[PDB]
């Protein structure tokens, strides 16, 4: 019951942080489409409006950086139980009582993979926000907006993997 409370804590933390990431990405795509429309509307034919749009894009980015620091705190938390338990149980314990059948190394594998995808996705978003207001080629602007919208460093299969944790924490009904 000691480890049970923290595994069902971390599953709920993973689910709510993914939903807050999605809401912040939708607001960021609306503001990036506005600043692209403003730059093409001047180039077909200001600095206070452009600087204001850049400042609130930076506000969206520091919100995402806060979410990234929370995901960092979630994986080190889980890594610990790995050691403590594995060591104390020592070997002579090929019977670890978890919830249904998993060991904790699968929880390390799932949290490590999700941390790697969201950590690379934040660096791609930082490069898009760095280079978006200074380009002039509209193929490159459509490319940069597509990299914001479609999120190419996040696999779909990991979302299936998150459902495996929700079948192994019992928040959802079986």
């Amino acid at each position: 019951s000691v480890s049970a409370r923290k595994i069902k804590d971390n599953a709920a933390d993973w689910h709510n942080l993914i939903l807050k990431w999605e809401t912040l990405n939708d607001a960021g795509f609306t503001t990036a489409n506005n600043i692209a429309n403003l730059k093409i509307s001047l180039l077909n034919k200001y600095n206070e409006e452009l600087e204001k749009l850049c400042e609130e894009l930076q506000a969206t980015l520091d919100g995402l950086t806060k979410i990234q620091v929370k995901m960092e705190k979630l994986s080190s938390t889980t890594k610990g139980i790995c050691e403590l338990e594995n060591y104390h149980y020592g070997e002579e314990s090929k019977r670890p009582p978890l919830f249904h059948t998993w060991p904790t190394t699968h929880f390390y594998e799932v949290s490590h993979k999700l941390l790697e995808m969201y950590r690379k996705e934040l660096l791609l978003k930082r490069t898009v926000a760095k280079e978006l207001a200074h380009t002039g080629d509209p193929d490159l602007t459509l490319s940069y907006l597509s990299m914001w919208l479609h999120q190419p460093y996040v696999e779909s299969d990991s979302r299936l993997h998150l459902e495996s944790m929700l079948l192994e924490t019992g928040h959802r009904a079986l």
């Binding site: 452009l50 850049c54 760095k130 280079e131 207001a133 200074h134």
Partner: peptide, 26 residues
């Protein structure tokens, strides 16, 4: 020194400062 030029971050290092009383530092 930090500034953000239209979203792009810029970092500068101050080497020499000369002021209006006529003293030059290093």
């Amino acid at each position: 020194l930090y500034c953000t030029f239209y979203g792009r971050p810029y970092k500068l290092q101050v080497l020499r400062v000369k002021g209006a009383d006529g003293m030059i530092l290093g």
